[PDB]
Amino acid sequence: MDDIVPDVLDAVPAGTIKVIYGDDLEVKQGNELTPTQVKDQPIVSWSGLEGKSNLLTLLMVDPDAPTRQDPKYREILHWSVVNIPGSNENPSGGHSLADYVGSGPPKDTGLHRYIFLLYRQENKIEETPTISNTTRTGRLNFNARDFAAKHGLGEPIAANYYQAQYDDYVPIRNKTIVG
């Protein structure tokens, strides 16, 4: 049930996620990062919120590609993760639905709001073999919210988001994709 959208998030998180970009800073409630520092790798962590859970679910939200105005083939590549052990602080030890890729959508998308959603996972789910980041065409277009709908991850335990745009140079990373 999309509630606080598109003001901040299509769901009211009980907590949040801590994504550290430049290491010196971090993203908060769709805040904007400047100047053009949105080129540094984001470090996701819920350190302190975790505790005791069979598993966890990290879902990404920002379906706009190549642009929210012309979804020629949205979504592109995304950092989807599930089955994360409820005590790793970050979505590492779990199944990477779709391996992380700092490529991101093409310049045509402009400032895009990458949103990180965290949800406690109780049941061990295969969720199909781990998809590689360099995954060639044929497995890009797909709504993230679906993962939430299928296992009922509706209500998010912790969420964090940020808005960023960059030179077509970043999207170029996608070109290296060969499956």
- Domain 1-179 bears CATH identifier 3.30.300.30: no
* DSSP secondary structure, 116-163, as one string: EEEEEE-S----SSPBPTT--SSS----THHHHHHTT--S-SEEEEEE
At 173, which amino acid appears? R
Q: Where are the domains of the chain?
A: 1-179
Query: What residue spans of the chain are helical by DSSP H?
Result: 145-150, 169-172
Q: Count Cα atoms within 13 angstroms, Cβ side, for 70.
A: 7
Choose among 69, 43, 72: nearest CA to 162.
43
DSSP tag of 132: P
Give the 3-state secondary structure of residue 60. strand
Separation between Cα atoms, residue 12 and residue 178, nearest integer Å: 37
Distances (CA, A) of 154 to 12, 116, 122: 10, 14, 14
Radius of gyration for the chain, computed over Cα atoms and rounded to the nearest angstrom = 15
